[PDB]
Amino acid sequence: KFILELIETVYEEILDLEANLRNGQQTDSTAMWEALHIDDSSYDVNPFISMLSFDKGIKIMPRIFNFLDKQQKLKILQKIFNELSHLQIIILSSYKTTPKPTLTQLKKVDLFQMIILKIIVSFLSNNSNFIEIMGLLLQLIRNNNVSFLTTSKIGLNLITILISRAALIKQDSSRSNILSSPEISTWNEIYDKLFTSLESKIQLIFPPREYNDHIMRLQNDKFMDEAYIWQFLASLALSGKLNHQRIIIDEVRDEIFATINEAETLQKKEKELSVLPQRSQELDTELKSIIYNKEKLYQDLNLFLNVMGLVYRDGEISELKHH
Ligand SMILES: [Cl-]
Ligand SMILES: [Mg+2]
């Protein structure tokens, strides 16, 4: 393709950069940047966006990013948030639009998650200010079916990364009154724009059990791993007013009780395994696995419950006591 040639020239441009890095020369990504075709609108679909559809394109991204400055990194993120709704890996990771992913589609989703989102997190955590997060957030909000996005694992995680970083800086800055009025106001405007794009569709962040089942079989284990769903719920809740929080917890209340029920079932299985005398190692690894799964369900729900000042503990939801 025209995209494989681009990947080879980008790669060569990388090796060049590395030699100059290694030989103590100043680094210049100008040619690497050009080779990505980030501003190129000649084609139906941008060639850098197209490059993200290839495992190889994905796998060289950390080395590309090693040579970019912050302005270049930001520009790349901006490009990604504009094309999000029709970005392949989003379509691939939505249960709506890809209700039965194959193993290789899954591994692709994981690869993108493992590599691209890791880079995005490092970048935003080491190089970002409130206004840049706001802009990325507005941009996502303006240019996508945000709810559709939330049905995607990558899409949701991208929202959570942005939203938790914003909350974090606002928290670190609040301790000494850094952050202007126009910024706190804009965040509450932007937050409320995000919120209202999700209102009444929040539960659609949880995929159908059927879909969960299909995925469990492909990966060979009994494992809802939905931490990323609860992490999103926690961050969404953390930045809302009481009104926002009551709406949220009301909309996901069936999922809260299904998770509690899931946890209670594992707790019962744990008890009946625990009373058995002189177990074999295989029985004991069965027991350790049930315990771990039980604890993960606790910890994942409690992530969200804690933000509402609640805690699930021993079959009960009670008021979280910090003191
Ligand atoms: Cl630039
Ligand atoms: Mg309302």
Residue numbers in the entry: 476 to 798
Can I see the authors' text?
We therefore cloned the ScPat1C (473-796) domain, over-expressed it in E. coli and purified it in milligram amounts to homogeneity. The SeMet labeled and unlabeled proteins crystallized in three different space groups. Only structures refined to higher resolution (crystal forms II and III) will be discussed in this manuscript. Three and two copies of the ScPat1C molecule are present in the asymmetric unit of crystal forms II and III, respectively. All these structures can be superimposed onto each other with rmsd values ranging from 0.3 Å to 1.2 Å over 260-310 Cα atoms. The relatively high rmsd values observed between some molecules result from flexibility of both N- and C-terminal extremities of this domain. This flexibility is also supported by the observation that residues 484-524 from one protomer as well as residues 788-796 (corresponding to a β-sheet, see below) from another one are ill-defined in the electron density maps and hence absent from the final model. The crystal packing radically differs between crystal forms II and III. ScPat1C is organized as an array of 5 repeats of 3 helices stacked against each other to form a solenoid structure. The fifth and final motif is capped at its C-terminal end by helix α15 followed by a two-stranded anti-parallel β-hairpin, which folds back onto helices α14 and α15.
The Pat1 protein is involved in different aspects of mRNA decapping activation. Hence, Pat1 is considered as a central platform protein for decapping. Indeed, the crystal structure of the S. cerevisiae Pat1C shows that this domain structurally belongs to the ARM repeat superfamily, which mostly encompasses proteins involved in protein-protein interaction. In conclusion, the crystal structure of the ScPat1 C-terminal domain has revealed two functionally important regions localized at opposite extremities of the domain.
